[PDB]
């Protein structure tokens, strides 16, 4: 098991595997359930967030801390998927699909390989998801804080610059990038 209640806190362990515990069947099973009655899962805290919306009607916050991009990003993506599945608004569901597909772009432009993690968050991210009177999603909002400065120009041993640099360097063979005169990653001082 990865999840465990620690008071109100939830604790997880990075399993490095894709366990099927994230099936949408399990997601709808978690729907309409009291806190802690099921086994621990972030689906439970998401359901508790919706229950708090029903009761107090005040905005919710879910905070993840610990290792950078170990279980944080994947858990946040699971939470987003849970919210999209519960709301079930076609245009809005497309909105969270865009958000999820974009998460790689901010990973490329704001995250980099480190000794701790090859996909490690190098900046503080904050994502707001709006809600109408129907408690349905209507929009999203991005906010960033404390981006690393040295990473742009300095890269430690076995540590890369922002993933976008290497991604564009390896993809420099595309015709539309040809006039960019971009070589491989080793051809530039910000990536070698």
């Amino acid at each position: 098991l990865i999840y465990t209640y620690c008071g109100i806190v939830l604790v997880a362990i990075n399993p490095y595997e894709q366990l099927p515990i994230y099936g949408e069947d399990i997601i709808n099973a978690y729907s309409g359930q009291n806190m802690g009655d099921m086994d621990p899962h972030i689906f439970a805290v998401a359901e508790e967030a919706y229950k708090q919306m029903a009761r107090d009607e005040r905005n919710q916050s879910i905070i993840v801390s610990g290792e950078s991009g170990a279980g944080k990003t994947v858990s946040a993506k699971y939470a987003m998927r849970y919210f999209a599945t519960v709301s079930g608004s076609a245009s809005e569901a497309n909105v969270e699909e865009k958000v999820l597909a974009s998460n790689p772009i901010m990973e490329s432009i704001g995250n980099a390989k480190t000794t701790r993690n090859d996909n490690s968050s190098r900046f503080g991210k904050y994502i707001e998801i709006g809600f109408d009177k129907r408690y349905r999603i209507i929009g999203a909002n991005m906010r960033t804080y404390l981006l690393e400065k040295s990473r742009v120009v300095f890269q430690a041993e076995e540590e890369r610059n922002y993933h976008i640099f290497y991604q564009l360097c390896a993809s420099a063979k595309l015709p539309e990038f040809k006039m960019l005169r971009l070589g491989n990653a080793d051809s530039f001082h910000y990536t070698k």
């Binding site: 290792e67 994502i127 707001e128 804080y145």
Partner: protein, 49 residues
């Protein structure tokens, strides 16, 4: 709102960014402690104890 920040991580060598990371994490922990204290007294006054 979901908040995604690396936790209490101290590298081998410290810098201004690393100190800012530690201080921000300490502020987050302070908010955690105060809010959980608020909630625990909330439940302690919900019940007759």
């Amino acid at each position: 709102g979901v908040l995604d920040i690396y936790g209490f991580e101290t590298f081998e060598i410290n810098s201004f960014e690393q100190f800012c990371i530690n201080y921000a994490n300490e502020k987050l922990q302070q908010q955690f402690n105060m809010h959980v204290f608020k909630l625990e007294q909330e439940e302690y006054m919900k019940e007759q104890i």
